[PDB]
Each structure stands twice: as C-alpha cells, then as structure tokens.
Ligand binder design. Structure first.
Ligand code: HEM
Ligand code: HEM
Ligand code: HEM
Lengths: 727, 727, 309, 83
C-alpha cells in the first residue's frame, strides 16, 4: 500500500547486533555475506518479495486480497472464487506430522573443518584435509514434548548434525548425555510411550514427572544411568551452546588399508558447560517457552557463533573385551579417564535459516546416513535405529523423495535408477531405469571401494551364533555406571540430583512406584537413596541399608569429566546482564558498566518500570529495553543496579522481586552506591557476602569482580542461604 | 564395464526418424535443440547419467548393486543394509493415486502463437501479439479406464492444454466433442459411477457397454446428445492428431474497456478429422493397447508435429437469449452455421517429455486456472468443476504445493504470503507472511485491474434470484441437438452410430434397459430407433412410431461441420503403409513405391514372415521391420503388395489374412503385377473395384491413385461388400 | 420409484445360475446363505440400501440430489452448498495408489480344511485338526500391468491366500510358477523396472515384449529359468482355476518338539491345468480385457467353485 | 482431507453419526463401509433408486435451503455497513 515507516526503522541492520537491539530476521537478509556451499546451493529455491506483484500460485496477479467474490456486497460467497479457494486451500493444508520424538527443536547452518588429516584411521573424505570445509546443518531438540512445547523442560537434549560431504551426507544424530535409557531398539516404543503424555488424557506435556515413566524405570533398571543424567542439572542446560554432545553408540572408523577402529563421538562446547537450576528452568517454561530457540538465534545474529569441538574416543579392535562393561551397550559410557577424547575438528554455527518450516521442520536426519570411512557396530539400539529413521520419514515428509526437499539435498552428485514417488522433482533422462543395462552403457555405474572416492563396502565383521531374541549377559549390569556418575558430581550437583528425583517422584500418584524407585536408588548409593527417601517421607528398611554398593568401573571411583562444574570452563561472551534503572541514574556508573560488559562480549538489557526513555543525572537519554516484569531475572545471567534516585524503585515490588529471584537462582548481583539499599530485601549483612558485588560506585574493581563471578556461572556457596528467602 | 555394442546400435540418432527406424528416447535426448521457454526452465531439474557413479539418494557411492548384506554368503539379510532399504523403500513407494477420471493419457510439449492481436475482444496477454509465443504442455486422454487401460476404446477423449503465459497459467481443459453428458456438476459422481466398472466386481474396463451406464442414460435424457457423439466414430479417433477439441462451456473474454464477449473454444486439427472403425479399434485394444500413445510419440519423433488451430465462437452479450437453446447449457452445441469459428492461432506439439511419470503423470490441469482477459459464466457444470480440480489435486499430488512440481510451475513470477504444506520447495525470505504488513512495506502488493499486467477482477455480472437447487427450465430439452447431429452425418456415419448403439445395448443384460433406450431414440429419429430396435429383436410400438420429431435448431436441420467426413479436409503426411514382401521382390516396384511415399511424407513398414532380410531380384538387400502377424494391418493406413515371387506368400495364411482384414476395415489396397493373385482372397472381380489399385507394375500413376485413396482415409463405398468376407 | 420394472427382472436370482443367465451381483446378495467365520465378522461394516433415505455422510437427508444450490436457477453455484461439496470431495478422493506390482488382480472368499492333523511336522494351528476350518481370501493377479490393464496378457500370475487362523493371519503369497526371475531382493527394482513400461514414454502395458526387459534378461542369465516358464503356455492360463500355484521359497515347518523341516508350498488345481494359445490370449485382451476376473466371478456364481489342494 | 488422511473421516468412530447414513459415495483411503448396493449412482432402476431423496417437510424431511433473495453484481467488495 505504502505501509512501512518513513525512517526505515521496520528493517533491521544487515550487520551483527546484540540481542534486543533490532528485530530478528531471516538469515539470508540478516547476514547476506555469510555463505557456504550448501547455503549457496539453496539460492535456487529462495524466494524474495520486495517489488513483486501479489499473485496466485499459478502466477495470476490479485487485485483485491481483502475480499471474497460475492453476489452483492452483502451477498453469498461464490464457488467461482478460485483466488479465495487456492488461498484457503494452502492454509488448510499447511501442517505436516511433527517428528514422533524430538518434535521440539531449533536449528542453524554452519561449517566444520578438521584440525589435521585423519587418513591414518579413516578414509572419510570430510576428515581427510584441514583445508577441506564441510557445510553443516544442526538441530538441537528436546525429546518428549510436541513442536509447540517449551524449551527449558527437564529432558535429554538432541544434538543432530547433517554434514554435507563430497562423498555423501553423514548425519551424526546424538544427544547431550553419553548413554541412552534402553539397550535394545525393540523397547523404544515402550520407553517412549512411558515418558510421553499418558494415553487416556494426554498429560503431562514435556515432563517425565508422572507415573508411567517412573513405573517403567522401576521395572527396567538399565534406564537408571540416563535417568541419573536427566535428574542432574544436565537435564536443564542454560543453552544449546553450553551443553556437551555425544553419539552414544560405538561406531567404526575404517581406513584405506581396511583397519577398523572403534569410535565414540563427542562434541565439546567451546563456550563451556552450564545449566540452569530447576526452579528457574520450570518458571522459564512459563515466561519464555522459546528461550533456547531465541537464545540460539540471537547468539548467531550477535556474532556469538556457537562453536563445538568434535572429539573421538578411539579403541583398538583388540581391546573390545578389556572393560568391565560391553562397548556395544549404549547404557554404559566410556570414562575419559580410561579412554581420552582426541580432538578432531571444529564446528561453527554461523547462520540462521530463512524459513523455519522449510529448513528446520522439514530437515531429516538419520544415523544410517554414513559415508565410506565409517561403519556401524552391533549395538542393538543402533541396529534398530537404522530401520526407524528411513521408515518414519516416508509419512512425516510425504513419500520417498524427501531427499529432494532442498535442506536435505546432498551438495555432491547423486545418480541412480530409482524413479517416481510422490512429489518427484528430478526429471530423469537416462534411457535406462535398471542395471545392468546396455542401453546407457550401464551408467550410472558401481564403483569399487578404495582409498578415496570409492564405493561403500561394509567392514567384514565375523558373525557367529544362532538366531536368537536374547539380551547379551554382558549387558546385565545396571548400577555401577549410575554410581560412577553420582560420585563424580560436586556436592551441590548431588543435591540438585536428589532434588530432581524428589520433585519428580512427588508427582507420581501411586506411592508404591515411589518406593520402588527409592529401592533402586539404594542399589546405587545409600546417601542418594536416603536423601530422596527423606524428601518423600519414606524410611529405608534394614535390608535396603545393607545393599552392597556396585563395583567401581575398571578401578575408577569417579571421573571429573562427568561433572558440569567440578573443573571450571567459564566463558562470559554471549551472556547477558539485567541493568535495573531509576529515573536519575548515575551516568558515570552506566558508562563503566556498559563499556566493561561490551569489552567482554557480554550483553546488557536496560530495564525499567515502564517502556520509553529515562534521562540520567547529566541529561543522557536512556532507551528502555523491557520492563522488570517483561524481562524477568530468569532470562539473564546476572543483575547490576547502578546508583541514582533509588527511592524511585526501592518501593517497586517488581524491582525487589527481580533481585530476590536472581538471588534465589544463585546469580551474581552488583549494587552501586545507594543501590546497596536493596541489601535488605535479600538479607545481605552489612559487611557483605561472596556473590554480591558492592561499592560506592561502579568504578575501579567493581566490574572486574562482577565479571569474575559471571565466569564462575553461579554462586554455589549461596545455596544454604537461599532456603529461607520467600521467592 | 563394457556392455553396450561397439557399433553403437544401442543409442538412437539425435534427429527426426520415421516410426520404427530407431529406438524411441526421452525428448531432450532425441531432439536436444527443440527448445521453448518452459523446456529451458525445466533444465534445473533434468538429471543426466553418463559418466556418473551409482549412488544412494544421500550421494554415497555404491560398490555392489547386486547383493544384500548378509552374515555369510548364504546367511540372513542384515537390518543394517541401508543401501538395500533405501532402494527398496523408494521402489515400494513409486505409485501415486491415478486421476479419478481421464487416468489414461498421453502428453507432449509444444508452443502456441496467435495469428493477430485480439486486444479488441480480450486483454489476455497471450493473445495480444502474434509474436508472443506461449509454451504449452498438452495431455490427451480417455475418460473411464485406469492409467493401464487401452487407448482405442470407445470413449470421449480429453484434450487439455496448459498455457504458460506471462500473466499466469491458463489451463484449457476440453474434450473431443462440443458438449458434455450432464448439465449440473452435482450429478458428475452419478454419471461417472454409472460409466465406470460396476462396483461389485470392477468390470468392465474402458467400456460403457454395460448395464449401469445405459440405466443412467435411459433415466437421464440430457445425456443423449453426448451419447450420440460417443456412439459415432467420433468415439474412436484414428489418432489424437486427427480429432477436434472443444472447451464445451461458454466462457467470457474481457477486453481493456471491460466489455464481456461470450466465447466457446475450439481446436481444429490441421491434419484433418479421421476415425477408426469399431472392429479395428477393438482389435487394436488387444494388439496394441498403447496405439495412440505410441502414435503421438512417434509422430513427434518423425517431425510430424501435431498441429491445431485455436478457434473462437464469439457471441455478443446482448445475444444471450437469441437461440432456441441456452448458451449456459453444456449439453447443447452452438452450430457453426449459426456462429462461425474465428481462427485465432496455431499450436504445434514438437517435443516428447523426458520422463513420463515426472511430467505427464504429475501434470495438473484445472479449468479454474484462468488469467485476466478471461472469465467464467454460470454454466452449472463449469461452476462445480471449479471446486473439483483444486480439491482432487490435494490428495493425488500429495498436498497444496503441487504447483512447485516442475511441470506445473508457471514460467512467470509468483509471490504471495502462502507458506508451508507438505514438500514445500520454495524457501521464503519475506519478513512478512501476511498482509497488510508494514514490516516489508506491504510487499508483495495487490495490483489494480488494467489493460495489461493488471490484477484479476471478475466481470460484474448481475445476479438476481433466490437461493435454489433447481434446474433452469431453459435446459429442459433433450432431443433436438441429438437430431441435428444425426441428420448431419453421412449414411455410413449413421450406420456406424446404429452399429455402436446396437453393439453396446446387446451387452446390456437387463432387456428392459435396452427397450428404454430404444424408446429414447424414438424421440430423436424414427429411422435411428428402428435400425437399432431391429438389431435388438425389439419392435417399436404404435405409440413409438408416432412420436413427433423434435424441432430444428434455429431453423437448421443439419450442419456439415458435425460430420467427420462430409466435407473433405484429408491429409496423408504421417500416415503409414504396410508393404508385403516375398523372397524375390521386384526392386523396381519398391523404388517407385518408396519414392512416391517419401514425396508425400507417408511412412512405410516392410513386412515378411520372419525377421531379418530378403533380397530383391537385383540383389538389393531389404531389411524387414516386422512380421505379418507381428505388425497387423490394424496398425497401418493402407497395404501395398509389390510384384516378385508371389508363390512364397500366396499360400501364407497370414499374408491372406492381412489383406482380408485391411479390406474389412475399408483401407486402400494396391496390388502390382503378380500381387493380383490375392484378388481371389478378397473376392474382387476382374474389371476392378473402386478402392483397389492394380496395374502391371507399381508405376507413377499406380502410386498417385493409392495416395488419392489415402487422402480420403477409407473406402466407404466398400461397406456393402465386406459382409461376405470371413475376417 | 416407478423406476424398477414391474416384473422384477432388474434383480438377479439369489441362487446359483450359469454364466450369462442373470446379471452378476455382490456376493452377499447373490448367495446370502453362504457363510464362514470371516464373512460373518465382516457383517458389522456391511452397508445396505433398500428403504433408506439418501443422506450426507453426516446423516443429513438430502431433498434434491439433482442440483447445485445457486443464486437463481441460471445463477452462480454458492460456496454454502455443503451437500454438493461433500459429494464432490468424496468423489475427488476415491483413488488410492495401486499396488507397485500385481496391481491387476481378482479375488474371492473361501475356506480351507486340512485332510489330517500334521502336528507331527508342524505346530501350526490351522493344520492341527481335520475339523478345523480356516476362512480364506485369495487374490489372483498378473504382475506388470496397472489395475486397469488386461487379464490374458503373457505374464507370470500371482496367487495370494490370506488364511484367517486362530493363531494369527498367515499369508501365502505365491505365483503360478515354482521359481522366480531373480536371486536376491536387492535386484527387484532393477528387474521390475526392466519389465514395466519404459520410463520415457510408458509403453508397453502388460507386456515383456520390449527392449529393456530382454536387455536385462540377456545380461542376467539367472532370469532364464522363469523366462522359460513365461514363454511357455504357463504364461497364458485359461483361467485362475486351471493354473498351479507355488510359494517358490523354501520355508520351514516347526513342530512342538522344535524340529525344523524344510518345506516348499504347492497349490494343485483340482480342475486340472489348462492354458490358452497366444493368438487367442492376445485377441482376448482386446475383446474382453476382464476375461479372467469375469470367469472367476461367474464360476463362483454358477457354483463351479474353484478348488485347490 | 489431509489432517485425517482422506474423505472417510466420518467413518472414524468419534465422528460417526448415530443415525442412519446411506448414499452412493464409494471408495477413498481407509474405506470401512462395505457397500452391498448393486447401484452406486442415481437415478438407478437396478436397486429401485434406493437410497432415495426425501422431500422437505415438518419432520424427518430432506434438507432444503431457505430461499433467500440474492440481488447484486459479482463483486469482491466489503459492505459499507461493515466499515
Ligand atoms: C542412542 C540413542 C538415540 C539417540 C542419541 C537419538 C537421537 C535423536 C535425535 C537427536 C532426533 C531428532 C533429529 C532431528 O533433530 O530431527 C531423533 C529423532 C528420532 N528418533 Fe532417535 N535417538 C536415539 C534412539 C532412537 C531409537 C532406538 C529409535 C527407534 C528405533 C529412534 C527413532 C527416532 C525417530 C523415528 C525420530 C524422528 C526422526 C524424524 O522424524 O526425522 N531413536 N533421535
Ligand atoms: C465440460 C465437461 C468436462 C470436461 C471437458 C472435462 C475434461 C477433463 C479432462 C480433459 C481431464 C484430464 C486432464 C488431464 O489430462 O490431466 C479431466 C480430469 C478431471 N475432471 Fe473434468 N471434465 C469435465 C467435467 C467434469 C466435472 C463436472 C467434474 C467434477 C465436478 C470433473 C472433475 C475432474 C477431476 C476431479 C479430474 C482429475 C483432475 C486431476 O486429477 O488432476 N470434470 N477433466
Ligand atoms: C518369490 C518371489 C515373489 C513372489 C512369489 C511374489 C508374489 C507377489 C504377489 C502374488 C503379489 C500380489 C499380492 C496381492 O494380490 O495383493 C505381490 C505383491 C508385491 N510384492 Fe511380491 N512376489 C515376489 C517377489 C517380490 C520381491 C523380491 C519384492 C521386494 C523386495 C516384492 C515386493 C512386492 C510388493 C511391494 C507388492 C505390492 C504389495 C502391496 O501393495 O500390498 N515381491 N507379490
């Protein structure tokens, strides 16, 4: 019509900008200069808008997109209105089935590069040269809830990476913990049904805190290992940038000489590991159910590209049987103290999608998509997965041509004798649709395996045994890995695990199920079991108190790589601070605060009791990002209250509650000058407290001290003190 | 690898060749330099073959495309064989639902151009300039049978043209007769269920010759006009090249002034009109159920492009009520004697598709696809069609993005706010998915209607009446048009109509249905009614004998434009002659025969009793295309038998049958020298018979006479004589 | 209304009648006294018609099933016509994909009974008791052509039997020759693409008589055994009644003791083996493309029930 | 049609009428009803035209639209009275 504002302010800057500074936008508009081979290959299907006429799908220009055709301006709508019917038809058919699991997920484009050639252990082309760059598309997800459920639920997270290599798509489809719940794929519908909403009423969404889950767990101790991980703060990551990734299964690397090496895949977050606390996570599902999705997108728009290091645990074929646990058992992890992770390469996620539906929702990842240089093993969970991903994609994406949906296409050549199916895009000119043929001189042709550009040939593993439906006896140990995990956690991590079990079991309506789980905990660790029992009003029996603890794992009592926090890795870049304003802020404080944060790549949001602007002591006009209620402390990592007319907000219950919530969730707080008046709301003593930064002004060491706390993520020593505060 | 022969017999010449001379091939390989804007724009999706490795759809090279992965070479197949499962999955899912009606069809690419600007009567961009070339894709079809049914059934034929214009796709979805069976779209499922295979047992395929069809006709006299056409030889076209097309409905042309002109659309076959005879068509359904599909493909490969002239019958809006039938009634034709067809442009079909499934099977034509400069009318059959074609495509082609299937895509721009849907190809970058919007300055934007490049606005027809489900009384006349058609036919055409009704009704099991049909015929014409009654063992009553004939149509008793044959327009270019060989043929006959045929662009096929070659009297080596039994006379337009050692064939039962059959089917036969020994088998007297060419040798005059017979198509004078030959 | 004839000759006799004597009818109207456990359990989804009002699928009685709702009797059809749109919508969506292979097929209900208990060699319940009667549904078919292709093509034929046993459905999915064309399932798409209509033009229907099939055969000698069968008169059976059936593969029988016995399955036509000749078969594809479907239906209606051992 | 997989959604148990439904519609994905009507079209004689149309009337009658008067040109236009 001519509907935009004259200043051009409807349009975000096509340049990196902090979160909240500009409206977010399709990736190709936001970052037009950020390219890779896959992103370039999608140009053929990207559709613009500006300066084009509005048409039907058939290209007929529409004159009046405001009205149906009727007989009289108050008359009945006419069936001949093809423009109305095409328009409503498309709308009526917008939806496709969501993924059966991991329906909720958020995705981005990036690139991967190896640090050195891995030719000695694998002929995989994408790992053959440090100068070889592989486009990726990554989706992170929750597990149980639908595509419209909340982000910060307690759940395992999915971490799936599509590598568009020169010799084929390799999908690495992993999670954020190094084991899974179950051993054999045949049980996946039972486990998933147990954790998903219960079938009579479809409650609860996004939660394992209900009877059927804990019933199944109580009857299937193989689940306890991943359940320990889920109940720990691992189940509630601060963001996808701050969690680990794992392939879980042992796979094989195959080199040019035909040697097989056992491998488990790791992703290490270069930003470090960090999680929420449960009360914060749960509240955040209400205040911002899109928190992780938003955080991912805005990090990328800001330039805080999520980076991950790919690492391999490598085990020689001759060492297959050298551990207390079976390598093929996906409920067991391989302790880094026994087998180190060797760094392999770096993955950087640097561009958001243009259209979430077209790129994210239709993306299809499947762990059967491997490339020469890789192979499978007989892990019975993996073995069944290979069937499932292909099968489910045929309904979810509407037939067997899902690889022609643009996000899914290989960047490399694909030719074969497959034809037809729904939505077929490729128009084949081969005279032949079969081989062997003479009529096209047998093209396209098979290719023998070889060191590079060769055909896929399976590693010739020996198979010997009878056709059985039987769990290997080597898989029948359930408690030592849970115990190993438990003992590796810090005291505050352990408390969080106790609290997770305690909260979940309290939602289980049938008391005998709670009892049964507590009994299982008593096989893992008596201290764990006692603390959970106490929280449930349950008394362990003398028999339970006497259950002997499970054996160590190959002589390991603990392994600190299993803790989120035991070995600090605190990166502050990309984190965010709430600044609580008043109507006459000390402009000197604000210059110091904002500049110090910017120097470390830490973002800020200026909050007030209303939107608009406030004016500082010296006339500086300050734009307000959000209100105290609008952007609660849940959404930030720390809080700073500069000096000024504090009486303006000391009376504001919202401002006080802001600090009390941030205090309760162990976040750093800094109070400059008269802001120290807020000490009383949070019961801070005159002399002070570790984790509260206070000075006459925001000058000197004030910002370094606050940033030091932010590097340590949360203020764990504050835990005994929070029990009392009413928040 | 080395499977093609080194001589190169495996690959057809990239140049026009006669039917049977080379193996047929994908259009882009056969005629790589036949181009138009649509065919060029499909290049992004054309996939080649030669010199590429065989891969999975994920781009992984396959080493052994001969074996499943098993444990041991005689062991069980393993679930981890992703290469097998992908290949079998795609195969398992190749099929999509066939079209509900017109499932059986054959298609080709071409182009249209107008003869002059039609801007005085329509602002349609494709009709504005004789230098505007519009790509087309045209699909011809039968109605009833499945996609696997036979071509030369007795049926109406579909003639659908997709015009890819600069202002939108216009689909002109017509048939080969100028009316339809029914008046209101609400009855379409009734009619189509009646004609389709009966629901208990699903018989018969591709035939209206069964009880339910004639039951419905007998009860719904509106059907009789199109039934007359179907029972005539119109129902069995020689080829899609030799039949007329009609839009059936009155539509509107709208000019820049906004004036509406009523129009009915016509296609005139520039090759002329020509049909098979019933016995030939029925036999052809068994010997070559692909006859018309083949004939189209091979005509195009030979450079014998199907050509049609677009014609308009134009009626001023003020003349709406000037006829004694209703213009909106699709069971009524507009006699050309009353409203002539203005010749408007020419369409040429000049390239076969590359892949039948991708381009023909997936093509989607819908009469609701119009463009500015065209509009609908209230014709109640057309009105309901508008709903159906959009609706059916949603399931047949798997969702609302069927316009992104390559063959269906407009060549002109399309931009709107529609999103998602199964198999969404387009990746939208517009910040906005709604209008009005400010965030993308309201683009894409509506366009006011105008003289050129304007938005679509419906013609503001006055609607006055009550909401009623009621047939207009103006539509309640059923016999006068059937009569006009009957009286317009030649005597042999009338006899073939009688024979069609008689043959169908003889297969109707319930005698009362046959009698009710003969009663309806008595309301049309008494001679027709008596002739059919007589063949059915039925005696017209006193009453039936005295039914008053229906009136003339605006004083017209007949209109020669409704006969296939009454007015000569015959043409031989692209027809075919079988030449019956012997072991020592008179080379001089062959040279003259072949020279004369080539001169007129008529093709020859050389037949004998075995494959291989024979040698002519003078050592000329003649290659044999097929055997007498392997390429029966059904498949050719005429038969010539040259001189030589006729004893080699004169006792060949098949050689005789060939001539008896061709004779039965009223085809021109030419006999040279010792070929005249065959005259005995078809009981021809020594003084000749019109339609049998015979001379001492195959001279220049002998060929001239034969080509004259071929231009008149069949020897109608022979009909009274075919009684007495057992073939 | 007055629509049926007064003498009642619109209605086929509900008793066995020879081919062509009466119009064919749905099995439960033609032979209402024939029953088996499976046919009896289908009764809850059978829908009648006599004396009922014509309705929408939501159960709304329709008054005028001859016309669309329009503004004026010569006016535009209105979008509010939900009776018209439901009717056209269901019509528009009648089709489902045909089978990838064996799309052309004809089927009938029947029953199976073993001569004696085979418990010594298999614990399969349907073979445990000469008194145990097992309902069946059997579909015979060609291989290559679409559902709308002709019956009497030269083709291998399918012979598929669904046994509704008390311990599960057993499907015996066989052909009318004892072997197949290929050795490993991986090549199935290759062989079937080769035999099916060629991908550029989709010709020919229902026939192996084209280049790509014989190309494949010439390059894959394993196909020669079944090709010999197909080129013989086995490829053109007189009717589904007079052909053999075979499971082809070796399967196992497992008895209560756990003993495996290797087994190949056979169907013997009790009407004897008989085939057409090629010229007769080809001509019949033209004159009656439904000849085998018709033959099967009409035999059953006449009481010449197909029997197999 | 897409959400419930085809035109037989009325045969999904929760959606089924409890009152009689009979017509000449056939087929469609997941067809549950097995029709025995020799006829799948009307008018038919072979089943004496059943199931039959029912005139409108006071009770148990066929649906007939209220015969509202329609007067106007074919327009894509918002009524001024809505503004
Ligand atoms: C090691 C244990 C497993 C891991 C790490 C894992 C990981 C994942 C991830 C990350 C996704 C979402 C991919 C995306 O973002 O689209 C996913 C989806 C899925 N998973 Fe798995 N999964 C596991 C076990 C299984 C098992 C045992 C089965 C069944 C046999 C299975 C069946 C599925 C299916 C059907 C989907 C939806 C796939 C789609 O619609 O594209 N998963 N899984
Ligand atoms: C003047 C009368 C009619 C003519 C000339 C006509 C013409 C045609 C033609 C030529 C085709 C095949 C298009 C192709 O080759 O893909 C076709 C298909 C079709 N027709 Fe019509 N038809 C008529 C009446 C109707 C009516 C009254 C309806 C429904 C109310 C209808 C519904 C359909 C449907 C559903 C298809 C299949 C469309 C597809 O699957 O893409 N037709 N028609
Ligand atoms: C011993 C060799 C084979 C025999 C005897 C056989 C037999 C049959 C029969 C009789 C049918 C039709 C069933 C019916 O009437 O509905 C059929 C269908 C089918 N067959 Fe096989 N076949 C064989 C090989 C194969 C192989 C190797 C494959 C794939 C790897 C295959 C895939 C199919 C498929 C996809 C259908 C359609 C199934 C459906 O849509 O319900 N066949 N086959």
């Amino acid at each position: 019509d001519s509907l935009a504002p004259e200043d051009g302010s409807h349009r975000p800057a096509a340049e990196p900008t902090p979160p909240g500074a500009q409206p977010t936008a399709p990736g190709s508009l936001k970052a037009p200069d950020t390219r890779n081979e896959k992103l370039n290959s999608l140009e053929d299907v990207r559709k613009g808008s500006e300066n084009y006429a509005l048409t039907t799908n058939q290209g007929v220009r529409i004159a009046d997109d405001q009205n149906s055709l009727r007989a009289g301006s108050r008359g009945p709508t006419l069936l001949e209105d093809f423009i109305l019917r095409e328009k409503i038809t498309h709308f009526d058919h917008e939806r496709i089935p969501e993924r059966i699991v991991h329906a909720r997920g958020s995705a981005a484009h990036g690139y991967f590069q190896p640090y050195k050639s891995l030719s000695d252990i694998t002929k995989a082309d994408f790992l053959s040269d440090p100068n070889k760059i592989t486009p990726v598309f990554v989706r992170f997800s929750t597990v149980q809830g639908g595509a419209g459920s909340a982000d910060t639920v307690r759940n395992i997270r999915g971490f799936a990476t599509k590598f568009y290599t020169e010799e084929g798509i390799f999908d690495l489809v992993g999670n954020n913990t190094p084991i899974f719940f179950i051993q054999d794929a045949h049980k996946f519908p039972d486990f998933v049904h147990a954790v998903k909403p219960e079938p009579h009423w479809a409650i609860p969404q996004g939660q394992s805190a209900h009877d059927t889950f804990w019933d199944y767990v109580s009857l299937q101790p193989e689940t306890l290992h991943n359940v320990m991980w889920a109940m720990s703060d691992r189940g509630i990551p601060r963001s996808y940038r701050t969690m680990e990734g794992f392939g879980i299964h042992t796979f094989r690397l195959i080199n040019a000489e035909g040697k097989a090496t056992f491998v488990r895949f790791h992703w290490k977050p270069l930003a470090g590991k960090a999680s929420l606390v449960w009360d914060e996570a749960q509240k955040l599902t209400g205040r911002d159910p899109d928190f992780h999705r938003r955080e991912l997108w805005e990090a990328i728009e800001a330039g805080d590209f999520p980076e991950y290091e790919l690492g391999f645990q490598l085990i020689p074929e001759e060492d297959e049987f050298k551990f207390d646990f079976d390598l093929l058992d996906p409920t067991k992890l391989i302790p880094e103290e026994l087998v180190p992770v060797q760094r392999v390469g770096k993955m950087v996620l640097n561009r958001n999608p243009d259209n979430f539906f077209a790129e994210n929702e239709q993306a299809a990842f499947h762990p059967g998509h491997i490339v020469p240089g890789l192979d499978f093993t007989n892990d019975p969970l993996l073995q069944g997965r290979l069937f499932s991903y292909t099968d489910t994609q045929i309904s979810r994406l509407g037939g067997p041509n899902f690889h022609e949906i643009p996000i899914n296409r290989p960047t490399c050549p694909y030719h074969n004798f497959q034809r037809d199916g729904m939505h077929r895009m490729g128009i084949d000119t081969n005279p032949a649709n079969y081989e062997p043929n003479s009529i096209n001189d047998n093209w396209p042709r098979e290719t023998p395996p070889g060191p590079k550009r060769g055909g896929f040939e399976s590693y010739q593993e020996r198979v010997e045994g009878n056709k059985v439906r039987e769990r290997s006896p080597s898989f029948g140990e359930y408690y030592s890995h849970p115990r190993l995990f438990w003992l590796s956690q810090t005291p505050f991590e352990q408390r969080h695990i106790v609290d997770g079990f305690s909260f979940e079991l309290s939602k289980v309506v049938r008391p005998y199920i709670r009892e049964r789980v507590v009994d299982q905990l008593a096989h893992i660790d008596l201290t764990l079991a006692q603390a959970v029992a106490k929280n449930l009003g349950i008394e362990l029996t003398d028999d339970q108190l006497n259950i002997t603890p499970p054996p160590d794992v190959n002589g390991l009592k603990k392994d600190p790589s299993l803790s989120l926090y035991a070995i600090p890795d605190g990166d502050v870049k990309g984190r965010v601070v709430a600044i609580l304003l008043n109507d006459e802020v000390r402009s000197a404080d604000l210059l110091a605060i904002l500049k110090a944060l910017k120097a470390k790549g830490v973002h800020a949001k200026l909050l007030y009791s209303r939107m608009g602007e406030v004016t500082a002591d010296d006339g500086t006009v300050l734009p307000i990002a959000a209100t105290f209620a609008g952007a609660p402390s849940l959404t930030v990592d720390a809080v700073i209250v500069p000096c000024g007319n504090i009486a303006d907000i000391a009376d504001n219950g919202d401002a006080n509650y802001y600090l009390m919530e941030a205090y309760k969730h162990l976040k750093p707080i800094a109070l400059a000058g008269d802001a120290r008046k807020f000490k009383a709301t949070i019961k801070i003593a005159d002399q002070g407290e570790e984790g509260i930064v206070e000075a006459d002004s925001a000058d000197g060491s004030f910002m370094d001290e606050l940033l030091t706390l932010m590097a340590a993520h949360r203020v764990w020593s504050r835990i005994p003190k929070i029990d009392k505060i009413p928040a």
